[PDB]
Design an enzyme around this catalytic site. Structure first.
Site, mmCIF file in Angstrom:
data_model
loop_
_atom_site.group_PDB
_atom_site.id
_atom_site.type_symbol
_atom_site.label_atom_id
_atom_site.label_comp_id
_atom_site.label_asym_id
_atom_site.label_seq_id
_atom_site.Cartn_x
_atom_site.Cartn_y
_atom_site.Cartn_z
ATOM 1 N N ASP B 52 -4.156 -45.680 -22.798
ATOM 2 C CA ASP B 52 -4.980 -44.542 -22.400
ATOM 3 C C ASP B 52 -6.292 -44.523 -23.204
ATOM 4 O O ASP B 52 -6.241 -44.478 -24.470
ATOM 5 C CB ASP B 52 -4.215 -43.261 -22.703
ATOM 6 C CG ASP B 52 -4.990 -42.076 -22.222
ATOM 7 O OD1 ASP B 52 -4.905 -41.705 -20.987
ATOM 8 O OD2 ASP B 52 -5.692 -41.420 -23.033
ATOM 9 N N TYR B 57 -14.428 -41.897 -25.827
ATOM 10 C CA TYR B 57 -13.802 -42.332 -27.043
ATOM 11 C C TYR B 57 -14.594 -43.484 -27.801
ATOM 12 O O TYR B 57 -14.251 -43.885 -28.891
ATOM 13 C CB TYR B 57 -12.368 -42.904 -26.802
ATOM 14 C CG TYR B 57 -11.403 -41.864 -26.298
ATOM 15 C CD1 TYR B 57 -11.720 -40.479 -26.236
ATOM 16 C CD2 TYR B 57 -10.136 -42.273 -25.806
ATOM 17 C CE1 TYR B 57 -10.835 -39.524 -25.759
ATOM 18 C CE2 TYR B 57 -9.258 -41.321 -25.253
ATOM 19 C CZ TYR B 57 -9.630 -40.015 -25.211
ATOM 20 O OH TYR B 57 -8.735 -39.115 -24.612
ATOM 21 N N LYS B 86 -11.348 -42.271 -18.189
ATOM 22 C CA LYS B 86 -11.672 -40.858 -17.845
ATOM 23 C C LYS B 86 -13.166 -40.700 -17.662
ATOM 24 O O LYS B 86 -13.939 -41.291 -18.483
ATOM 25 C CB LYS B 86 -11.119 -39.877 -18.861
ATOM 26 C CG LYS B 86 -9.667 -40.164 -19.331
ATOM 27 C CD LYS B 86 -9.120 -39.042 -20.200
ATOM 28 C CE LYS B 86 -7.732 -39.345 -20.796
ATOM 29 N NZ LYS B 86 -7.878 -40.270 -21.959
#
Ligand SMILES: NC(=O)c1ccc[n+]([C@@H]2O[C@H](COP(=O)([O-])OP(=O)(O)OC[C@H]3O[C@@H](n4cnc5c(N)ncnc54)[C@H](OP(=O)(O)O)[C@@H]3O)[C@@H](O)[C@H]2O)c1
Ligand SMILES: NC(=O)c1ccc[n+]([C@@H]2O[C@H](COP(=O)([O-])OP(=O)(O)OC[C@H]3O[C@@H](n4cnc5c(N)ncnc54)[C@H](OP(=O)(O)O)[C@@H]3O)[C@@H](O)[C@H]2O)c1
Ligand SMILES: C[C@]12CCC(=O)C[C@@H]1CC[C@@H]1[C@@H]2CC[C@]2(C)C(=O)CC[C@@H]12
Ligand SMILES: C[C@]12CC[C@H](O)C[C@@H]1CC[C@@H]1[C@@H]2CC[C@]2(C)C(=O)CC[C@@H]12
Lengths: 325, 325
Positions: B52, B57, B86
Site C-alpha cells: 500500500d 507518501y 492513491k
C-alpha cells in the site's frame, strides 16, 4: 470472467492451503453415479477448487475421472484442485490404512489426495462390507486404537500419498487424544463435522480455533435428508424465516445465507448439489457479505438439531455425539 | 515454505482478488524515503503480497523499484503483487485524475496499479503544492463534485491503468453519494479507513459489508504516532493490557492479536514496519486463530480513539469525521 486464477483459501497448520468453499459429492444410492461425474465437472467449471469425497460414497472412480477430464481439457491444473478422500471405518486398523488409501487412489487414478481424513471414529470389522452386521442387523464393531490409526495416516503423508491429514466427526475428547499422543508428528489440519445454523458447533469450533484446526462444515444446507440416516420429522433448515429474511434483504437465497454464515465465522464450508443451476448459485457465496447484525440473527437460530446422528454406531466410547461437544 | 504459491485473499465486488494482509509503506518525515526500498523487498520476501502506497507518501520510486527488483530476481510475479496507490486531493478535478495516476505509474515504472483510491474526500486547489495555502496560511480548498472524480476513476479502470478502484477516508454519507450516483459503472471495491481495537468501526464496517465493499484497516497497530498528525498523549494501542494478556496466552505479540482480530471480522488489514524482524513477525497472523470469547474481549476495547483526525482538512462538507460514521 474477471480473474479465475485466484480463489479464497485458508492456510492449514501444515502449511498447505485449503479453498474455503468445497463441493460435496455424496448422493443417495438411487441417484446414478453418472450424475457425480457430470456434477464435479460442472462444479469445477463454476469455480469450485475443493472437491470432497470418501471411499464409502462409492463415487471415487467418477469423481477422479471428472477431475482428470477438467485437467486434460485445460480448464484447471492439478495444483489448483484440492481433493479430499476419507478412510472408512472398516480400515481403521493401522495395517489397513495405507491399503485403503492406495485403493482410493487407484479408483481415482490420481497420484495423491490433497487431504485424507479418518471418516468416523467408531471402527467396524474389516472386510468388503462397509457396514458389516450380524443376523439381527447390529453392526460388527471392531476394537482399534485410533492413535495407531493416526500414526498410519502420518506415514501416508510422509509417503506423499496425502498432502494433508485430518479427521471427521471427532469430538473434543477424541481431538485431545490425538493432540496429546506421545510422539505426534502431524496435528490434524481439520475436523469435518455437521455444522449449520441449527447446530452451529460453537464450542467445538472455538476449541478447534484454539488449536489452529480448521472446522469444515458438512450438511451446511441442512443435509441430504436421506432416510433412515436423517429423521424425516426434523425441521427443514432452508425454510427458516430468518434465513429467508436475510436472503430477501441480500437478493440471494437461504442456501447462500447458510454458506456465507460459515465463511464469516472462519469455517470452511461444503455444499453438495447435482443441479447445474444450484452449483453455479452456490459459488455466489463470494459475492456478498453479512453484517454483524445478520450474523447475530443466524447465531440465534442454534437449536440443537443434529441431522446426522449415526446412532447405529452408538455404544463404543468413540461414538462421538453423546458428549456435550 | 510448504506452499508459497497460495495465500489468503478476498474476492472484491469487481471480481479481482485482494490479499488480506497488506504492507504499509508510509514512514514519518525524519526517515529517509530510501528506506522504503529495502522494507518493501523484505516484505515481499516474508510473504506479503499486497503493498500500500500513495502519491503523497513520496516513496513510489522506491516502492516501484522494490517490486520490480523482486520480480526480476524471480521472487514473485507481477500477478502475485497487489499494489495500491492513491489520488491526492490536489487532483480531484476529473480532468486531473488520469494525469495523477499516470504520474504515479511513471514513478513506479509499472504499467498498472492493482488498486487506485481517492485518498481523502476534501479537495484542495490544483498545482504542484500538495497542501496549497493563502497568505494567512489558510489551506486553499476547492469545490469538486466527487461523483465526477469517481467517473474519472471509472475511466482509469476501463483503460486498464487501475485493475480496481476504491476510496479511503469515506464516511457513510460519502459512500452513499457514490453508490447512488446516476449512471454508476463500478462500485468502490473498498473503503480504506483507520481501524483497530480502540476504534473498531463496527457501524461503518457493517455498512460496507451490506454493500460488498471491503473495509481495509490502516493504523491497525495504533498508527505511526507522527506529530503533528497524532497527539502524543493518545493511548498507545499495543500497550493495551487485554491485547498483551492475549498475546502472552498465545505466545504471540500484541501486534499479532490486533492484526488477527481484523482478519476474523472480515477486514483486510495493513501493517507498516521497516524492521526486518517485525515484518516477518506480522506474517504470522496466518498461524493462529482467536476464539469467539477472545474476539468479544477485543470488541470490548472500543473506545472512540481516532488517532488520525486530519483536521487540517476540517470545515468543508466533505470532511468525513464530523458525522457519527
Ligand atoms: N464427513 C462426513 O461424515 C459427512 C457427512 C455428510 C456429508 N459430508 C460431505 O458434505 C457434503 C455436503 O453435505 P450433505 O451431502 O449433507 O448436503 P448439504 O450440502 O447440506 O445439502 C445438499 C442438499 O441441498 C440441496 N441444495 C444444494 N444447493 C442448494 C441451493 N442453492 N438451494 C437449494 N437447495 C440446495 C441439494 O439438492 P441438489 O443436489 O438437487 O441441488 C441436496 O438436496 C456431502 O456431499 C459430503 O461431501 C460428509
Ligand atoms: N489511507 C490513509 O489515509 C492512510 C492513513 C494512515 C496509514 N495508511 C496506510 O496504512 C499503513 C499502516 O498504518 P500506519 O503507517 O499508521 O501504521 P501501523 O501499521 O498502525 O503501525 C504503527 C507502527 O507499528 C510498528 N510495528 C509494526 N509492526 C510491529 C510489531 N509486530 N510489533 C510492534 N510494533 C510494530 C511500526 O514500527 P516499525 O516500522 O519500527 O516496525 C509502525 O510504526 C500506512 O503505512 C499506509 O500505507 C493509510
Ligand atoms: C449409505 C452409505 C453409502 C452407500 C452404501 O452402500 C452404504 C453406506 C452405509 C454407510 C453410510 C454411507 C453414506 C455416508 C454415511 C451416511 C456417513 O457419513 C456415515 C455412514 C455412511
Ligand atoms: C501523508 C501525511 C503523513 C501521514 C498522515 O497519516 C497523512 C498525511 C497526509 C498529508 C501529508 C502527510 C505527510 C506530510 C505531507 C505529505 C506534506 O508535506 C504535506 C501533506 C502532508
Amino acid at each position: 470472467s474477471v480473474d479465475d486464477s485466484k480463489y479464497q483459501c485458508v492456510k492449514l497448520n501444515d502449511g498447505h492451503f485449503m479453498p474455503v468453499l468445497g463441493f460435496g459429492t455424496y448422493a443417495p444410492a438411487e441417484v446414478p453415479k453418472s450424475k457425480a461425474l457430470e456434477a464435479v465437472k460442472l462444479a469445477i467449471e463454476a469455480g469450485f477448487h475443493h472437491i470432497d469425497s470418501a471411499h464409502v460414497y462409492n463415487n471415487e472412480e467418477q469423481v477422479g475421472l471428472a477431475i482428470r477430464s477438467k485437467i486434460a481439457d485445460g480448464s484447471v491444473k492439478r495444483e489448483d484442485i484440492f481433493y479430499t478422500s476419507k478412510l472408512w471405518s472398516n480400515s481403521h486398523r493401522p495395517e489397513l490404512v495405507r491399503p485403503a488409501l492406495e485403493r482410493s487412489l487407484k479408483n481415482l487414478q490420481l497420484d495423491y489426495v490433497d487431504l485424507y481424513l479418518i471418516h468416523f471414529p467408531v471402527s467396524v470389522k474389516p472386510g468388503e462390507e462397509v457396514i458389516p452386521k450380524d443376523e439381527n442387523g447390529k453392526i460388527l464393531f471392531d476394537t482399534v486404537d485410533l492413535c495407531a490409526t493416526w500414526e498410519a495416516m502420518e506415514k501416508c503423508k510422509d509417503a506423499g500419498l496425502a498432502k494433508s491429514i485430518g479427521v471427521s466427526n471427532f469430538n473434543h475428547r477424541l481431538l485431545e487424544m490425538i493432540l496429546n499422543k506421545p510422539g505426534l508428528k502431524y496435528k490434524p489440519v481439520c475436523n469435518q463435522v455437521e455444522c449449520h445454523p441449527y447446530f452451529n458447533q460453537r464450542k467445538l469450533l472455538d476449541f478447534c480455533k484454539s488449536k489452529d484446526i480448521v472446522l469444515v462444515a458438512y450438511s451446511a444446507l441442512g443435509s441430504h435428508r436421506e432416510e433412515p440416516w436423517v429423521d424425516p420429522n426434523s425441521p427443514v433448515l432452508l425454510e427458516d424465516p430468518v434465513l429467508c429474511a436475510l436472503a430477501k434483504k441480500h437478493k440471494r437465497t437461504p442456501a447462500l445465507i447458510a454458506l456465507r454464515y460459515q465463511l464469516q465465522r472462519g469455517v470452511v464450508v461444503l455444499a453438495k448439489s447435482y443441479n447445474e443451476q444450484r452449483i453455479r448459485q452456490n459459488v455466489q457465496v463470494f459475492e456478498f457479505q453479512l453484517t454483524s447484525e445478520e450474523m447475530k440473527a443466524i447465531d440465534g437460530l442454534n437449536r440443537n438439531v443434529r441431522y446426522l446422528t449415526l446412532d447405529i454406531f452408538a455404544g463404543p466410547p468413540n461414538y462421538p455425539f453423546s458428549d456435550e461437544y
